[PDB]
Swiss-Prot record, chain A:
It catalyses: an 11beta-hydroxysteroid + NADP(+) = an 11-oxosteroid + NADPH + H(+); cortisone + NADPH + H(+) = cortisol + NADP(+); corticosterone + NADP(+) = 11-dehydrocorticosterone + NADPH + H(+); a 7beta-hydroxysteroid + NADP(+) = a 7-oxosteroid + NADPH + H(+). GO terms for molecular function: 11-beta-hydroxysteroid dehydrogenase (NADP+) activity; 7-beta-hydroxysteroid dehydrogenase (NADP+) activity; cortisol dehydrogenase (NAD+) activity; NADP binding; protein homodimerization activity; steroid binding. GO terms for cellular component: endoplasmic reticulum membrane; intracellular membrane-bounded organelle; membrane. The active site is at Y162 (proton acceptor). Gene3D superfamilies: NAD(P)-binding Rossmann-like Domain (3.40.50.720). The gene is HSD11B1. Its main location: endoplasmic reticulum. Homodimer. InterPro entries: 11-beta-HSD (IPR051253), NAD(P)-bd_dom_sf (IPR036291), Sc_DH/Rdtase_CS (IPR020904), SDR_fam (IPR002347). Glycosylated. NADP(+) binds at residues 20-46, 71-72, 98-100, 162-166, 197-201. This is 11-beta-hydroxysteroid dehydrogenase 1.
Amino acid sequence: PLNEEFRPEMLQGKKVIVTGASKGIGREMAYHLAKMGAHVVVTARSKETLQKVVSHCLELGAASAHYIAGTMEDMTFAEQFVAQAGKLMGGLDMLILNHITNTSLNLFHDDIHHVRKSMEVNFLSYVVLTVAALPMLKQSNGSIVVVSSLAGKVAYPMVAAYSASKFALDGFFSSIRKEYSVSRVNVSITLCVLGLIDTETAMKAVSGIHMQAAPKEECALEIIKGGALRQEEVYYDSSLWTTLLIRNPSRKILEFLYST
Amino acid sequence: EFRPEMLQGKKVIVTGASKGIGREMAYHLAKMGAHVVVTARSKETLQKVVSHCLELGAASAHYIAGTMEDMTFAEQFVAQAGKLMGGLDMLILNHITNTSLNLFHDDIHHVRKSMEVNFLSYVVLTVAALPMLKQSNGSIVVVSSLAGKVAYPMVAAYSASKFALDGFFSSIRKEYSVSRVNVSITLCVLGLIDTETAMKAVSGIVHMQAAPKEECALEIIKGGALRQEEVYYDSSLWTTLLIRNPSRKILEFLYSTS
Ligand SMILES: NC(=O)c1ccc[n+]([C@@H]2O[C@H](COP(=O)([O-])OP(=O)(O)OC[C@H]3O[C@@H](n4cnc5c(N)ncnc54)[C@H](OP(=O)(O)O)[C@@H]3O)[C@@H](O)[C@H]2O)c1
Ligand SMILES: NC(=O)c1ccc[n+]([C@@H]2O[C@H](COP(=O)([O-])OP(=O)(O)OC[C@H]3O[C@@H](n4cnc5c(N)ncnc54)[C@H](OP(=O)(O)O)[C@@H]3O)[C@@H](O)[C@H]2O)c1
Ligand SMILES: C[C@@H]1CN(c2ccc(F)cc2C(F)(F)F)CCN1S(=O)(=O)c1cccc(-n2cncn2)c1
Ligand SMILES: C[C@@H]1CN(c2ccc(F)cc2C(F)(F)F)CCN1S(=O)(=O)c1cccc(-n2cncn2)c1
């Protein structure tokens, strides 16, 4: 945990992966990383929009910028990609897991395909990616950034499948963090709990069925700062006070009462 | 408010009932004269459980054997079990894939397996049982853990799956409130319980004070019977108090208005 105020320069020449960076917040994090002269590798399924993104990262000031098109549904591609992007940058310092499968707001009936798909993409691919990135992150004492949500901390309706995977992220990576402490692994693990963010995808699914969205740009920055400064958790949401209710002191105690 | 006569003639499914807490719940339900259908992989042991349940005063007691790794078996087990009992009033989800206490070592197969068995099958069982439960205005009782509420080392995959249950079943619980579906969801957060599988997994390394599996089962059963939302059961009273999370409830309401 860096006891320090953030400075863009922290990312100058840092080698960073960003998943789900063909649109929404993943696109935003790429630009910010570009301006800070970082080496970026972005990924997603659409090779078209990815190029558009790479094109722009270069001209913003990236030290380098590549895209690799694939689907995170394919566990063999997740592993490969991370090695491909390892080659492209000569190492890895930060791993930003951002991508999610196409979700929408709907009551849950019998959609067991979507529940499994959600786990596989939103959660299980993160673990694979992580296993593949770890050898290189350990070398650079780097960081894992996992993007999550309010729905991954508290229960809302119409996002059950989605919320289940985000909860799963919390439990797994939090437990891994604890393991890196005991195991003395020096790789930071940052979990970001985002409220409604005004991405193209989000605003479509929400409209009509009535809240307030936060800017995707500041949002992308906040994620990157929490990562750079190696914080445990990062909160972001339109309301400030909202962010205050998310931390759980009781969870903090129960976690200690059984360490020793 | 609880009284064993609440289960009298209640059609109940208990999963992972061949051993540990599953076994103990069947026995409790069998003293209350519930109709009971149990399951697990081992028929040899499931038979021993089924006979004992009848000696105890079970309205009826049968087993159907299979691995919950098989979503097909899981979907059929619930039809077959409901058809046999002429209905379902309570669904006790309690089985988990064999787990040991270990640091993560890139064993993704184990993570996938844990999600599949400990979590996705719970949803398949639920989808299959829902119609009968909407019909009996009954209950779903999901059995979870402290490691499904807070982070510990040595139980990553086990932890992700238990967290998954909370996020899914808590979200659908809120969905059933606005759909007026009348079926309760009870998430049970249990600390260390003295089942044989638990005590061989921990006692090696550092250990704790293990609550009694028999009482634990009854608490699970009562909780569901009273249609509570959560149920905490641990040796310490200092645990129960901390497990509750008041901020969450406030956020849940705050953005529920929508
Ligand atoms: N925006 C919000 O309101 C909000 C709120 C809470 C949490 N979050 C979290 O913030 C992150 C981004 O939200 P977002 O609105 O920016 O998502 P988004 O706008 O829908 O874009 C998601 C990204 O995932 C990629 N993707 C989709 N399917 C994929 C697959 N099978 N394999 C690989 N990549 C895939 C998409 O590119 P392609 O489809 O072209 O492959 C896209 O780049 C997510 O983790 C979400 O959980 C967002
Ligand atoms: N005991 C604890 O320390 C503790 C603490 C917190 C939470 N819990 C929760 O309490 C519940 C029971 O724990 P427990 O101590 O009673 O475990 P247990 O005693 O070892 O019983 C596990 C049950 O699951 C069955 N099972 C295993 N694999 C299966 C599969 N692939 N498909 C279907 N069934 C399978 C086992 O029978 P077969 O092998 O013959 O199939 C057995 O009946 C679990 O949800 C656990 O997470 C326990
Ligand atoms: C609603 C947003 C955007 N979602 C999202 C993100 C990217 C997508 F591509 C699609 C979505 C989704 F369709 F789920 F909205 C995922 C869920 N989140 S959230 O967890 O930040 C959140 C905040 C506040 C309230 C809620 N509520 C849910 N029900 C009621 N309130 C959810
Ligand atoms: C360790 C026990 C028994 N486990 C269990 C249940 C059934 C099994 F079949 C196997 C296990 C397990 F191997 F995880 F022990 C599941 C996990 N739990 S727990 O969530 O009740 C718990 C309470 C307090 C501390 C911990 N810690 C774990 N590491 C550090 N603290 C876990």
